[PDB]
Amino acid sequence: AVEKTNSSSSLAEVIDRILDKGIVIDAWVRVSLVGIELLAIEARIVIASVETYLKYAEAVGLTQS
Amino acid sequence: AVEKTNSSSSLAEVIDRILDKGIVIDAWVRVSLVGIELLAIEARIVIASVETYLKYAEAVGLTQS
Amino acid sequence: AVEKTNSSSSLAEVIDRILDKGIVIDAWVRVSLVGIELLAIEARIVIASVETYLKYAEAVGLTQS
Amino acid sequence: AVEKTNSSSSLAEVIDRILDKGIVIDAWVRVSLVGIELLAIEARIVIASVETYLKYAEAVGLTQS
Predict the structure, then answer these.
(1) What string of H, E and C letters represents the secondary structure of chain B?
(2) Given A17, A34, A59, which is nearest B63 (Cβ)?
(3) How many CA atoms lie within 13 A of C58 on its CB side?
(4) What subunits touch chain C, counting only 3 or more CB pairs under 8 A?
(5) What number of other Cβ atoms are within 10 A of residue A34's Cβ?
(6) Closest Cα to residue A18, out of B11, B57, C11, C10?
(7) CA-to-CA distance for C18 and D12, rounded, in angstroms?
(8) Which of A4, B32, C22, D45 is the most exposed, having the fewest neighbouring CB atoms within 10 Å of its CB?
């Protein structure tokens, strides 16, 4: 272990710091007419650590609770 | 760890400071006639930390509460 | 950390100071005839911190209250 | 922090001093005939700090009061 004057390193630390903080993007569009809706699209993309997905699933009920 | 005269660094800190404070943009348009509406569009885009999305979902009821 | 004679910095601080104070623009037009209206358009665009959107939603009733 | 002989600075302070004092422009036209009106247009544009919009909304009743 030798200290470095620069914070540059390999991609392993970049991947770790990307995964630990978690990434999720939600996109949805709703179209309605005269009060009623005729279509509704909704989706999301998730890339995060495995620990938070258990918590997501138990929030939505997949995990035992 | 060596102190630097300039605050410039890699993109990891930029990504972290972007994600922690949270980003959300809401766009919607409503058109009405003689009192009644014939169409209404509404949507939003969210890019933030995973911690605040649990709070959003429990505010809207997805998370267990 | 080295003091600078000029306040110029990167775009991160500009983005932070833009987002913290909040931005919202409201545009609406109403057309009426002989007392009654035949059309009414209203919309707004919001770009602000995530903290104030919970307060907006609870003011309009989306957040639990 | 170094004192300057001139008050010139970046655009951040200009934006802050523009937003804090608040901007609102109201435009409306009313046309009437033999006592009764046949049309009336009214609109306004607002660009100000988020704090005063809560006060506007509670004045018009949107905010809880």
Answers:
(1) CCCCCCCCCCHHHHHHHHHHHCEEEEEEEEEEECCEEEEEEEEEEEECCHHHHHHHHHHHCCCCC
(2) A59
(3) 11
(4) B, D
(5) 9
(6) B11
(7) 8
(8) A4
Other C-beta atoms closer than 10 Å to the C-beta of D36 total 8
Q: What length is written for chain C?
A: 65
Resolution (A): 8.0
Of A17, A28, A58, the CB nearest to B43: A28
Strand, coil or helix: what is A55? helix
- Which tokens go with B35? 């009192």
Residues on chain A touching B18 (C-beta within 8 angstroms) = none
Q: Which of B53, B55, B58, B65 to mutate to test the interface with A (most CBs of A within 10 A)?
A: B53
DSSP result, C14-54: HHHHHHHH-EEEEEEEEEEETTEEEEEEEEEEEE--HHHHH
* Residue ranges of C 18-57 with Cβ closer than 8 A to chain B: 19, 36-47, 49-50, 53-54, 57
